Every structure is written in C-alpha cells, then in structure tokens.
C-alpha cells in the first residue's frame, strides 16, 4: 500500500467561525509536507496553507477559544 | 447523534508530548457539547491523547508543525 499527500491546493484562510474541525498531520511516511485540513460547518473539506500567517492566526484563534 | 458532538472527547489534557511522537492532531473549537477547545493527538503506534490547548508548550509544538517546511 502506498498513501500520498491529499491536497492538489491549499488556500490561504477560511472564515474562523465556518470551522467544525482542523486536522493537522506533519511529514512522514505518506507526504513530505505537513498538511492542513479543515472541515467546515457545510461538510466541506478545504486544504490550507500552513505556512500562511491568516491560517497560522486562525489556528491560534482556534487554540485560544476555550473558556 | 454521534459521542464526540455530545460531549468533550477528553478524558484529560497533557501538558506536553514529544513532537516526534505525533503521527496528526485534530484540533475542535469549542460549541454546545464542550466548553474547551480540544487537542487530540494521535501518537505513532495509535494512542490519543489530549494536548492542552492554552500550555505554551503545545501551541510552540503546533507552530513548529506548521512551519516544518520553510527555510
């Protein structure tokens, strides 16, 4: 078996709020890059950008949001 | 319907992990079922387990994922 990269693109931001979940996979056996996927709240699955600063910042947002 | 949109997935969250060890992390904002953000990170072999969100510790780990990649 041989697994590989799933993004074609990554995109530079979504809306925070549109989030349900992120995935965050770093290099390995399967893809050399880390990659990023959100879910939304529609269902939609979008690659982003890791290295994007709004995606980093969406991210830490994300992070923060808890009370 | 589903568990983990009825209540929080975590039983518990870690300071720390060894990066290395991540295989993927799920990260959730929190909503109606959990007050918190959670972390899951898989770790090699399968184990997850929950990073806590707020720890400098594990926001520096989720940097350094991100940011594997650049020069």
Do not use: W, Y
Not at 12 to 39: M, Y
Request: hydrophobic fraction near 35%.
């Amino acid at each position: 078996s041989e697994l590989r990269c799933q993004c074609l693109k990554t995109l530079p931001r979504v809306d925070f709020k549109n989030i349900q979940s992120l995935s965050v996979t770093p290099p390995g056996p399967h893809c050399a890059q880390t990659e990023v996927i959100a879910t939304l709240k529609g269902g939609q699955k979008v690659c982003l950008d890791p290295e994007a600063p709004l995606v980093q910042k969406i991210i830490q947002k994300i992070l923060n949001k808890g009370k």
